[PDB]
Symmetry: C3
Subunit: 114 residues, 3 copies
């Protein structure tokens, strides 16, 4: 799985250990080994949510399976919790797009996962 | 809706008020309340379009509904118009990927829209 | 087609000519003329892959057709080869998400490709 967060929160506000925390919590939530979890945090962005430049985040979670109605609710609770606690971003200024990728449509190690 | 634009145009060339302009015009075009429109502008990027490093943009528009052939033509006319007028990017050096998101696959406010 | 590579490799490690090389090789691989190929390289990113911060890449390839099991294996071989040779990123620290876009869902030149 791959989780990306784009935010207007400044780099200095991203706590040390945040990538490791995301990695561990996503491993637990998706049930996948941490070795397969990739995380990417993009601070200092020029963004707005509802016209406002207050702290916000635009995010994505891609996984081969483990994506669905109830699972995405659970991911959203987890991830908005983490963004509120660690980055001080209000949950109602976060979007997370979820993508259930087909194994044949994910490249890795010079081939695909199919 | 969430609109991202990635461009090689420098930050200083992005006019003041551009994120608000995008927010307003996307609200009007998509018919969505502006409170739900998120925008993200990423200048100074290392990119090429057709092998050329002249001004270009790679963009995405995600929305829960309001995505389709005629609607996307209308969005493209609006958004290319804005990128040409404000960033001086030729319309034929813009790509916009359109995504019709399922409500169950968009997280917001510690839950999803399903 | 549009190819994006996000990486923690620093900008100074991206060799001169890399965007051109990507453009050429993707033209050859996808069979589409280089005038239609767009490329975007994003260095210096805050990212981890499998819990660590050695060189890695998170990538996407969007194309109107020319996406499928065997084709994506071929793309992954090419692209991981290039990222290893030029950026010294191990192939097993690369993910590439492949997207088969419908022509009506890609904007260009103030309209769509439909």
């Amino acid at each position: 799985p791959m989780f990306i967060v784009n935010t207007n929160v400044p780099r200095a506000s991203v706590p040390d250990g945040f990538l490791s925390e995301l990695t561990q919590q996503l491993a637990q939530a998706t049930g996948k080994p941490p070795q397969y979890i990739a995380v990417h945090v993009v601070p200092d962005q020029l963004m707005a949510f509802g016209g406002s430049s207050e702290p916000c985040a635009l995010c994505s979670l891609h996984s081969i399976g483990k994506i669905g109605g109830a699972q995405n609710r659970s991911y959203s609770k987890l991830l908005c919790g983490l963004l509120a606690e660690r980055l001080r971003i209000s949950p109602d200024r976060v979007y997370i797009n979820y993508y259930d990728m087909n194994a044949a449509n994910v490249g890795w190690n010079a081939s695909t996962f199919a």
